């Protein structure tokens, strides 16, 4: 029913829509066009926040860590991190940067701390995920171009990849709930998964934007009473404007919410 209703909403979207809903309380998914590749853009830095926190995890990294940066360091859409070129930040502020408010220099800088998009990916290897690939820094991961498997990820694989390390044990729990609280702190997406959420409704979420009309939000929401369930959002190529692609998004979180509570 779920999956018929989104049909009809990427009726509307304008482009391509890929959804993928992952109850925790079943392990049942449900998803439309859950297997095809979709451009990540910002969605990627939930799952460069968690390879920072695996290797805080592991000794390797430390969240107080200072980092030191100039101002050709700076890439666009760089909110915090433009502020703090005198000071640096710590890995952690660098985190809740990239998370809260999708700063670009910060997902550049943990990037770089990491060793590179190939990092991540690597992880994202080691923990399971065959599918999602960072190609690119900020900000030309954002290109979006149809056909180009560049930094994409399949619906299926995020809403699989978000549960095991927001929900799972790939993470400590101390890296989990923290993680979970910067997506919960999340400042950029109140008018896509949110807009769509009763008020009591815990979420977080992280979005992602980019060329080629691509809107994107992927969160952890908690229905009371209840397990989380995992909802990825990728809509692409759409040609309505981005307060509509917006809108198309809280859509999916209405219908998300009628599915799981009547």
């Given amino acids: 029913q779920l999956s018929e209703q989104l049909a009809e909403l990427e009726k509307r979207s304008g482009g391509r829509l890929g959804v993928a809903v992952l109850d925790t309380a079943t392990g049942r998914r449900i998803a439309y066009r859950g297997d095809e590749r979709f451009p990540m853009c910002s969605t990627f830095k939930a799952l460069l926040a ?14 107080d860590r200072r980092i030191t940066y100039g101002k050709e360091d700076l890439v666009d859409y760089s909110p915090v991190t433009e502020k703090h070129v005198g000071d640096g930040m710590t890995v952690a502020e660098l985190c809740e940067a990239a998370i809260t408010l999708s700063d670009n220099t910060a997902a550049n800088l943990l990037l770089e701390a990491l060793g590179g998009p190939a990092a991540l990916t690597a992880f994202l290897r080691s923990i399971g995920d065959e599918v999602t690939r960072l190609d690119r820094w900020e900000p030309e991961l954002n290109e979006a171009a149809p056909g180009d498997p560049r930094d994409t990820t399949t619906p299926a694989a995020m809403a699989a990849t978000l549960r095991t390390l927001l929900l799972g044990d790939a993470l400590s729990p101390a890296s989990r709930q923290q993680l979970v609280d910067w997506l919960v702190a999340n400042k950029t997406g109140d008018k896509r998964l949110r807009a769509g959420l009763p008020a009591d409704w815990r979420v977080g979420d992280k ?27 990728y809509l692409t190529e759409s040609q309505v404007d981005a307060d509509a692609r917006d809108a198309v998004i809280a859509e999916v979180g209405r219908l998300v919410v009628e599915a799981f509570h009547h």
């Fill in 207 to 233: 979005t992602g934007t980019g060329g080629h009309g691509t809107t994107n939000d992927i969160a952890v929401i908690w229905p009371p009473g209840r397990a989380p369930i995992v909802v990825t959002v």
């Fill in 50 to 63: 968690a390879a920072v926190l695996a290797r805080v995890d592991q000794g390797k990294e430390r969240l």
